[PDB]
Write a protein that binds this DNA or RNA. Structure first.
Lengths: 92, 92
DNA sequence: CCGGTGCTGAGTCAGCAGG
DNA sequence: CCCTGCTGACTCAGCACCG
């Protein structure tokens, strides 16, 4: 009957408890349940939107940190290649 | 009465002078309508900014991932070159 | 001390995409 | 044909400014 109980019980459990009620009330209670559930759906939707904003802004940092790590790696190899190439061309 | 577009763009000084003579109920009603219409567009901009922000972030992460892909290919090319010269050098 | 403003959280409804 | 879960869009509440 109350909002917390109405939103908690299943429509299967609802129809059984709704037995003995006017057809006017049954459709009225069922639509009250939907409203309360949409309230919860809204909370999840807004929360998800936030989490997705964070994992994007976080992935951006996980990539920037990787890019900088890789630019250092090419600097080591480029220098190391130049070393071998200079030593090689010297021997023709 | 009046239009929505004019009712929103109007300044308070113009709007007040525009309803000199109207009943209190109508004045309050019209004022509430201006607030409602404003809130409608506020939410429109907010969701707009949210979407635009989201698209900016995604494009950055796509550029970064592409950049990482480039660098990964680059170290693979430099390492192969460095090792190739090693073999040619060690021989001669 | 009042009122208009811009913003944003939360609630509502429509309507779409699946159980 | 319902029901579910979700999301866009409107509304209001309430805060933080402002004039």
């Amino acid at each position: 009957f109350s909002d917390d109980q109405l939103v908690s019980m299943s429509v299967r459990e609802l129809n059984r408890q709704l037995r003995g009620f006017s057809k006017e009330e049954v459709i009225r209670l069922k639509q009250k349940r939907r409203t309360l559930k949409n309230r919860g759906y809204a909370q999840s939707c807004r929360f998800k939107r936030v989490q997705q904003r964070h994992i994007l802004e976080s992935e951006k940092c996980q990539l920037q940190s990787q890019v900088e790590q890789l630019k250092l790696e090419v600097g080591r190899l480029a220098k190391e290649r130049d070393l071998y190439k200079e030593k090689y061309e010297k021997l023709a």
